[PDB]
């Protein structure tokens, strides 16, 4: 019989843990085997008139689909003057802003990319 | 950080001369005064590569100082049944029966049905607390009597629930039974579900009058002052067919109630059939009918989903207007909002000599500057210009208070970059109760937001707002075209899409050429009929936009500020649940326009092809550019030049969303194909409407469908139609200080379309 | 090259004992004799890594020699009105009116309506030749009189067409007028369409009796011998409301006919309302009603699309059973086929002692070997085994004569490789008229094939067939499971899905465990009800397959060999045109099962997740494999082993189509998750059902939805359900000479499910 | 006025010609700048347990979506014995088979790949 809904959990989350483990290991292997994509992203983070390499694209495809609880974005103190990196929190909560300010949004985007690579290295 | 401290909205978007608009402003706390004045919006994009922010102050009878005050907002759906005579607080025995479908059964304390005061614990309620269904009476001494169910509720499972108060034995009883069938619930008839209970408790106190109204999907906060009951403990999920009896019930009576049989029709104190009123025009009313015959009529507040699947729905009929006895439910999300119901602060009657243009009321509080944009129409029946600009207000409401980047996990993947957000986005995320949600969002349940409203402060409608995809999205992206028309010598009127819905093609026929905003993604059926009637008989139009007739919209008939959309598999953020595709406001299907044999190509030549949000492209001239029938378009443009290589929105002209030529979807046979856009990245994709099987490589530069297309065709009686098929066309007009290919092409077509000669044939 | 020279089919797929099956065989030319005998199919895959081809010859009363002969096939849709008394060849003046919608107006000579002999040019016809509408009468001397329209027809544009013969002036007239509205046609009301004409010609000859039947969408070939008219010049596209008057008409009468008004009700010789008969169960009949009142009733031949959008369809109703006066059309593709109508060559009455298994009739012609597979049932009301194997005949018909690799441009992209094709594929491509099309194909118009039939030679149903995606697909992929059951000691019965449709859960309850074929993609609604009733009360089942309940199917009530499916945006090859989603056979929606709140998870635990066809993967054990509740599944399997790394279908177990666990779609709450498949390539994709916005990286190894999932859950009364969620599970059983993880796991579960003890509560 | 349907053509085909020209030039530049993907496809044309490089994947994505009129496939004279390369023709027409026979289908697949690269080189 099935009578108490607290006896049961979403057992797909076990596979989500397994999948994220293997997927993080693959991503740091990609960053170690092609170290020039970091400077490629530093030179042009939008890919404007020079589209990304497929390995930089594969790293982007890992980073850009994660859940929003704990995802980074770019706050604007003053537009076209100052940019900070903020972490998404719960509802009713202000974001946790960073410390370093930036001048343009390309610099902030490359710093978010570097901080994401530091966070995926820190968990392993 | 920079904190927003003043808010506000209009009663209505568009106002002709002589008639009155009202402005409802709120501050964080009741202190001080705010300043106000009237401005004419000219330009909104503050990119240093562009013209920068532009406005004009207007001397008016509006300005002054006004007392700043905090105005409370009721937030979430409920049905309110007003009962001043305490007819629904019985003196003796009573019983409450309803069907239940809970989507968040473990999210705090949630009231299902009540006549309950909560400041003093008096009345009765039937509620979900700590995951279980609890029936509680109270007298007002604080000491209450509750009965608590045994089996906790499963999520999205239909339950029949009877709560009985019996003073003859001084006993509260609670009967619970699950009514799952093959189609109505989350899981099916294969599980061995054991979630039925019959419990009983002792009643120490008697239920007293709560001096509130009877509520469905909520608990009343305090005693009803000024004839208004505040609702606090909001329930999430469907409630079907509630009823109060004036007698006590047994287990056999609850067993017959569980099978949908109305036992004892003489003992019903009230009986609300939520499907009573479904005709062949849907159910476009908030009136909830008491089917018992006592005049205890209710009212839907904050627009719950009328016309939803009930407990007895099997999948044999999926239109609610044809099987209304299976569509008797009502969804009640906790974060619905159709009106803030605030009190007016000031008003404005439009003078005789005010030009029809974009306008805003600049609120100047302490260190916070807020605007409230509205639109001035030309006087009724007149037209003071040859050019009409349709402001895209239905798509302003669809994107109103949009929170994709905080709520959607695929928000950063659709854009090609990490998004940049303002303080308006963190104030939407922190004070959600004051603002509401967008149709591109979901509720806390999971289902998308269907109804969106104008009577709320819409934080991304202000012209200094920048959006998460990139530069700017709805209203400042239209102020690009407004600034371009003002920089040249063109004289234009401004209408909205609510006005076009009200007036038909009679509004459109007053003008030689009708222009279109940056992104008119949402249209009603009548707007499409008006555009087709306008172009069919000698009318001229420009489609300076993309995705231009995608979703079908109906404006609510009783409430012209509320707009409904229900979505499906397409370029979507959500899909409607299986039996619920048909609109409440008119009982029609209305999904996307392409699925109803009214594709956007069939009127405007091109239609939705691809989307993607990292940067933009440029147009390359096709061999029809050198045709001598369209030398008037390509006049001062060299035949080896790129078109729009550089701009303010994304960095080019063909970008952010693209439309293509397609005869099979209804493109007219004499359409010329002038140019097409190249250099689109891998983030630009084929829309799901054009796929049979997804195979690899449905991307930009790897599939032929990913492109934009600049087209022209002419209609009868000297009409014509010109499309540029790109969102970022208008963001490339003021590039290089208005000296570029985009402004020369658009100026060529606009100078030809305002002449008295007919538009040139193809 | 190797040329196929002998064909053949059955009247029916499944036959119990005592009852008779008939076999209809054809050769290329009438000479010689063919041999025939009965075999029991055991194994079909001839991969040298496997067991190789296996069969068993059975002594029967069937074998012998039979005369080989060529049997002609009528191919394409038409409505036939039998008229032996020449009532529809009038002696004086007559007029023919109909509405027209042409999809290939430039594809040769096409007859729309006729009573025309074409061997001798006698009778009258109304036809499209050289792109124009031509009205021709004839006497039989070869010399005819024609009138030819001025304006050629536009493609998929509704036209009203009146053809008048007037002997009082000796004058043929032809009136033509386009009736486009906002919704009915290809383009809309914005084009300046000038395609109306009134022409006239001289009539030299008189129309004589053609001794044929009146036809719609075709021309009669020769004189009707044996009471049968052969149709040759097939029309493609809709025809709405045809009528013959016994008088001549003027231009005012044609002008009133163009607006849908029946002028002169006394002068109608016949008037066929194609929507007459639409009730609330659709229109499940071939009877075409003469609404004039003369008993000239017609008959639909080769199944044209009943219940289609007519000329007066505006989009206010999209179900044909609720607005039947706008759904009066009939589509008539030129390559429809529901029955070859051949003559019987022999028959077979099933003996008393023949085991219920897979059977075929091996035709031995000159150098060509052809089979005709059929199925033997256990006797009526009995069961001779504990195991039932449901043969997946509805999905055999859906893939019958599948030609994706020759017709679809994305055929090679969905597979991950260049396809390899047999001589059966080149014989389908070269002789299409003898075979028909699949539901994964399109017609020559573009619209997908809805109806598929058993009474035709199905060339990919034979066990020596290999398929374009890779190894083997429908019937040999089930002979994998048949060979595995015969290699072990298991004793099984065989039923089909037509039998399960006929018998309900009464068929299923006779057995302890019911197994499922390799790929049951198509199910009826009643089959899903039967499976849910079986599992709900103590039944046990294995789902050794993927994509297992995707599309809703209805078998035609009058014709149990014809099957209908109508598709939409999903894992599809085509989508139905806008107002035409509802089935003719029952007036219900029936798209995919997930859109009707009957997802495959809701019965079988897992459902469609991903597809892709280059190679397969292997399962890795999840932490629930080490749970002690399911140690009976994982008995002789080490907890560090891969599962199914190597196989005959693709090279692994988890592959070619995958199903996943999802509680939100209806997976039971007590389901355990044993293993999951990894190492899927970029060609494996997320199905469109699970996408909101397509962003990059919806691929294998880049998205969490691309996986398979081996699950188990138990139901009440000692039932249970085990799924492996992969097509290539059964192709991995006989690997390493039956010594692998796949056969040990499947043998563990099958040994537990046949015991008298209840299945373990998990 | 719009009266004669032979006065009008699908003008999207002009862009299809432009698109196919630029797309063929891109593909032969990819084959010239990474010449090891040909031996990668020769070693393992299914990608079985060694998935393709993204440049080999981009070449596959060009080749596998072309129209069927003129597309190559693999005929079987005898299964697991002999394989030939055939060209798709109209309805009612036998395919035009090649000359070289092959032993397994991997050899036939790599030969179809080489013949496709020769055909895209011959048009330029
Ligand atoms: Fe949108
Ligand atoms: Fe399929």
Residue numbers in the entry:
A (entry chain D), D (entry chain B): 8 to 131
B (entry chain C), C (entry chain A): 1 to 762
Quoted from the paper:
Certain bacterial species from genera such as Paracoccus, Pseudomonas, and Alcaligenes have evolved to use DMF as a sole carbon and nitrogen source for growth via degradation by a dimethylformamidase (DMFase). We show that DMFase from Paracoccus sp. strain DMF is a halophilic and thermostable enzyme comprising a multimeric complex of the α2β2 or (α2β2)2 type. The active site consists of a mononuclear iron coordinated by two Tyr side‐chain phenolates and one carboxylate from Glu. The Fe3+ ion in the active site catalyzes the hydrolytic cleavage of the amide bond in DMF.
When the purified native or recombinant parDMFase was imaged on ice by electron cryo‐microscopy (cryoEM), the micrographs unambiguously revealed two populations: a smaller molecule measuring approximately 100 Å diameter and a larger structure of approximately 150 Å in diameter could be identified. Subsequent 2D classification showed that the smaller unit was a dimer, and the larger structure was a dimer of dimers. The dimer of the parDMFase is made of two α and two β subunits with a total mass of 200 kDa. In the presence of low salt, the enzyme is predominantly in the dimeric form, and this equilibrium shifted to the tetramer at higher salt concentrations (≥200 mm). Subsequently, we collected two data sets with no salt and 200 mm NaCl yielding reconstructions with an overall resolution of 3 Å (dimer) and 2.8 Å (tetramer), respectively. The high quality of the maps allowed de novo tracing of polypeptide chains of both the large and small subunits. We used the dimer map for the initial tracing, and the final model is shown in Figure 2 B. The model from the dimer was used to obtain the tetramer model. The initial EM map clearly showed a large density around residues Y440, Y399, and E521 that could not be accounted for by amino acids. The mononuclear Fe atom is tetra‐coordinated with the protein. It is coordinated to two phenolates of tyrosine residues (Y399 and Y440 serve as monodentate ligands), and a glutamic acid carboxylate side chain (E521 serves as a bidentate ligand).
